[PDB]
Amino acid sequence: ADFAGAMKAFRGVVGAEWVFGDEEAVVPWSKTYIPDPAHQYKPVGAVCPQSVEEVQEIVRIANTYKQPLWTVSTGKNMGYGMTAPATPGQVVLDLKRMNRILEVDADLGTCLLEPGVTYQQLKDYLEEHKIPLWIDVPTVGPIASPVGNTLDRGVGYTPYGEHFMFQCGMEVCLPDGRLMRTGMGSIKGSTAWQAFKWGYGPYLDGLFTQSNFGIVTKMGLWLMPKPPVYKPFMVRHANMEDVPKIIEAMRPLRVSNLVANCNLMMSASYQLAMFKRRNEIVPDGAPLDEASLKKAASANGLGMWNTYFALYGTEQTVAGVEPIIRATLTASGGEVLTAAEMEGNPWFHHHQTLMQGGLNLDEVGLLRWRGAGGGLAWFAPVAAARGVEAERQTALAKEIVEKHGFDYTAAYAIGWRDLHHIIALLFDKADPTQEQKADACYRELVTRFGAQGWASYRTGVNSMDLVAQQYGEVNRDFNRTLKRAIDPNGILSPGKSGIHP
Amino acid sequence: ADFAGAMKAFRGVVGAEWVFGDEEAVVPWSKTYIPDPAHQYKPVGAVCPQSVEEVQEIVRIANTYKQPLWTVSTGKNMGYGMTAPATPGQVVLDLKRMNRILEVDADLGTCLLEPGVTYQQLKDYLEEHKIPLWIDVPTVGPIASPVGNTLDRGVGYTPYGEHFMFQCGMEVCLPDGRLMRTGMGSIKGSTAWQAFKWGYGPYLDGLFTQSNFGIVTKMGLWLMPKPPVYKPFMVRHANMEDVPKIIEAMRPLRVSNLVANCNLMMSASYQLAMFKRRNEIVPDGAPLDEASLKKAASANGLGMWNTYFALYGTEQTVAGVEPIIRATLTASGGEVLTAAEMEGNPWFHHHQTLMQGGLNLDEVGLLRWRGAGGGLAWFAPVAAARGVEAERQTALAKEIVEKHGFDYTAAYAIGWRDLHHIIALLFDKADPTQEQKADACYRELVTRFGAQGWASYRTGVNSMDLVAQQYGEVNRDFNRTLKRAIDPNGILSPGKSGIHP
Ligand SMILES: Cc1cc2nc3c(=O)[nH]c(=O)nc-3n(C[C@H](O)[C@H](O)[C@H](O)COP(=O)(O)OP(=O)(O)OC[C@H]3O[C@@H](n4cnc5c(N)ncnc54)[C@H](O)[C@@H]3O)c2cc1C
Ligand SMILES: Cc1cc2nc3c(=O)[nH]c(=O)nc-3n(C[C@H](O)[C@H](O)[C@H](O)COP(=O)(O)OP(=O)(O)OC[C@H]3O[C@@H](n4cnc5c(N)ncnc54)[C@H](O)[C@@H]3O)c2cc1C
Ligand SMILES: COc1cc(C=O)ccc1O
Ligand SMILES: COc1cc(C=O)ccc1O
């Protein structure tokens, strides 16, 4: 790599003012919440283009100078490494200034976006034009990116929650600087780019998700029509051990699609950590004991597990399924509550917002849980939607975090037939002993979950290799074959998903 | 290629009785319905393994002897080339003996299948075990394969109609003979292979659809729970020119998911061709005129367009949406009819069967339309679900087929935001002039649709290059890069989707 020559060429493409080339100038791309005891996850440079033509020039220069680019959209991957590259010596390719909304079709319920478009922008666009379409917001929201989240296959809480399922058409800058459009996009004068996902011949959009094979410059998305009627619900379960009964009750409702939105099943500990610090619940050096959790949860109108769903359509379509849903959840020991019961409950308000694709007051209390705070790593293993799987995963996760002196703070995102078990590893990152302990605990979570047949849907830069190691040796070798063929100079995001040149 | 050495080694793997190595032995793999005036689409051999270990040995031999393999599951790609390879000198890898149902999960609504599993087998398995799951049948059916059909991204007529969206997990024999499991399948002891589609890192399952990058040896599929209530409907439109009004009415019902199943919008000409020969409607050498079609259609309880949809769930969920659906379709000039009205109507019976995932009596009347019959090529361009697009596509298709002396016989498969415009080019293949004219007509359909920005979701072995040429040069070159890196010896299905070593 010839860094000085690459950065000088970059200034010629975007201007000196959008190239950041020394320790001091790249401070804005350098903060992470993941454990980094060796301080190895840090960029050496940032370049901020406003056009796809600039992106294509940047990629040609990157090849010529063998200078790797770590590409981000808005770079708000909080708990997954923010804008920190997976390996040393990378320049962040920050696409935040490519923030053009390119198309929105009210009739077909579609849009086409540059990567820099924020949830806030797209919400504002729809409201300002009176377009009765909804977005699907992965908790974070405001200055996060539909494009960046969809490319890391993130999740929101409407019927359109599984973001990658609703992506339709993308444009990619390939490692050699050529643009390719997927699906129907490469047909001159096509009006079906956001209409038909697959195109003809191999389906390649997936290659550009959680990967380093290309730079996405445009992406299409399907958007849900605003329903006549929106009815949010909260189910309260009293006991830490109700986990399997909740999964077993929700699964038939989801498999049969009586409930269509991805459901957050929130632990009392996680909910409390949103608005309270740990030392408001229990003293430092005391465990987060069941009795203290139950008391604090109860005083805040929360159970030990709080599961959020919604019904969408007419008063008549809602009336069609609400009785069966209530009877199933009640039989599981759940108390089903509506907005009228949950007035002024901030958790209900948080979920009520998310399940209509609303944006919440951008405020992340989890970062202040323990001591000086500032430590967050998502450990996000998959499970089949089986109560015994949730039961066993919760039990192993609790044993491992408690062994390292950390708390179990978790939610299940319930899908159709699967579950994202989201485990927030919360620590004091400012205390270098605690950062080291959180690193060791995270390694033990990954290793011991993998030995039971469980592994991550998504991970942070500090664990991408160890999570890749849970999956097959053939998978790893095949992704290396693709990398070497697609990006011969190894200049796109080396070590993303454990994929190294 | 060393054909004799390969075929001798293949006998060692599967036994002499499952290797077919000369003109007369390969006749069962050589019949096609597509136009082939040069008789160029024909295998030189066939091999029929019963195990994935046999497949791996066959692929190792193929690489050693440089002998290409054209892989098929059941090989019933009727109107898309059956088991004919896209290029000369290929041995069919016929996987029909790998017909094991590996898993069926009643609770999660999943299965795992070998490629030879037929629709009939899976239906029988579900009924024999009293498992209240449905399958989703692409018209064809009985002896077709859920695996083969999903790998070519075909379509059925339940809410699970878009087969590739419901695939979850696969095992592939890569060109070097190594097995690789996608999604969660490469995690030893994973119970989530059929639960979570994406896995971790680049999503690769699309690479093995409409492609020659791998041999699929196992595939997971999601299956729809049998609903309490199934209510099939037929909408009858009176005029050939109602096309745009039908699409414009269905689109909001589909975009808002009031109607969740892929809807077949059938031309009177196609319906008549299912049960009648052309010379029962008009004399040979007379055009298939609007008056004659209308008369024959009306005599059979059909309109000029007949659109099929179903409602699934309870009496209450059905009652929730049926009024809005009726009002919308009636306002478009459609007459909405139920089973009670359409008693003994064989078209209603045909669609009523499809839309509950039933299998029809395996009888393909389309193959006897004109003269000696035997000529069928699907021309299957995509459209955005816009009335004006259907209007313009129908108009150009009719002008081109009519200019070559053929009829417009077509259906639209209505999807969420897309249409599959399925044009059946019916011809007398036994008349070598008529086969030549159908070849020329087919070339004119692809080239002139492509000039208007329209191209195929799927195409027969005779047109795979001309359809690839409609899509981008960067797409073509990128698929060649992947082919060369994934299959260095070019031994899997050369020319599939226009992809050549
Ligand atoms: C309290 C809290 C709650 C959260 N809740 C959720 C949640 O419910 N669901 C969820 O999904 N996430 C959640 N997150 C995680 C995270 O904040 C979001 O997923 C966020 O949307 C990701 O940041 P982003 O949108 O800026 O994407 P980016 O950081 O811009 O993109 C993420 C990654 O995608 C790739 N990438 C991005 N753009 C491109 C491009 N143009 N071409 C190629 N590769 C590219 C890169 O690998 C990049 O690191 C949460 C985080 C916190 C702290
Ligand atoms: C009247 C009529 C109506 C039809 N209606 C429909 C319809 O509604 N919907 C529809 O989708 N089709 C329809 N078809 C087309 C066709 O009959 C079906 O799509 C059928 O399911 C395909 O044949 P098959 O299942 O045997 O798959 P195969 O022919 O076995 O597979 C198709 C292709 O997939 C690939 N392939 C298959 N197995 C593998 C493997 N294991 N590894 C790698 N590649 C593999 C090969 O390219 C192969 O040619 C219709 C045909 C007719 C004549
Ligand atoms: C379902 O995905 C996620 C959810 C959250 C918080 O609910 C954090 C990270 C994720 O990846
Ligand atoms: C939706 O796909 C298809 C449908 C049909 C129905 O005649 C035939 C071939 C196809 O590919």
Author numbering:
A (entry chain A), B (entry chain B): 43 to 543
Copied sentences from the primary study:
Enzymes of the vanillyl alcohol oxidase/p-cresol methyl hydroxylase (VAO/PCMH) superfamily are found across all kingdoms where they perform a range of metabolic functions. These flavoproteins share a conserved FAD-binding domain and a more variable substrate-binding domain that enables interactions with a range of substrates. One of these, the 4-phenol oxidases/dehydrogenases, catalyzes the oxidation of para-substituted phenolic compounds. A fundamental distinction is that the oxidases efficiently react with oxygen producing hydrogen peroxide whereas the dehydrogenases hardly react with oxygen and typically employ other proteins, such as cytochrome c, as acceptors.
The sequence and phylogenetic analysis additionally outlined a peculiar enzyme from Novosphingobium sp. that belongs to the EUGH clade and distinguishes itself for lacking a flavin-linking residue and the presence of a valine in the N5-interacting site. Thus, it represents an unusual family member that naturally binds the flavin non-covalently. The enzyme from Novosphingobium sp. was of particular interest because it was predicted to lack a covalent flavin and to feature an unusual Val/Thr pair around the flavin N5 site, beside sharing 43% and 36% sequence identity with VAD and VAO, respectively. The protein was expressed in high yields in E. coli and is thermally stable, with a melting temperature of 67 °C. Although it belongs to the EUGH clade, the enzyme is poorly active on eugenol whereas it converts vanillyl alcohol, with a kcat of 0.29 s-1. Moreover, its activity does not increase with the use of bovine heart cytochrome c as an artificial electron acceptor. The enzyme was therefore named as nsVAO, although we cannot exclude that it might use an endogenous cytochrome rather than oxygen as physiological substrate. Its crystal structure confirms that FAD is non-covalently bound, supporting the notion that removal of the covalent flavin linkage does not drastically affect the properties of VAO/PCMH enzymes. The protein exhibits a narrow tunnel leading of the flavin re side where Val181, homologous to Pro151 of VAD, is in direct contact with the N5 atom. The ability of nsVAO to use oxygen as electron acceptor thereby aligns with the oxidase activity observed for the P151V mutant of VAD.
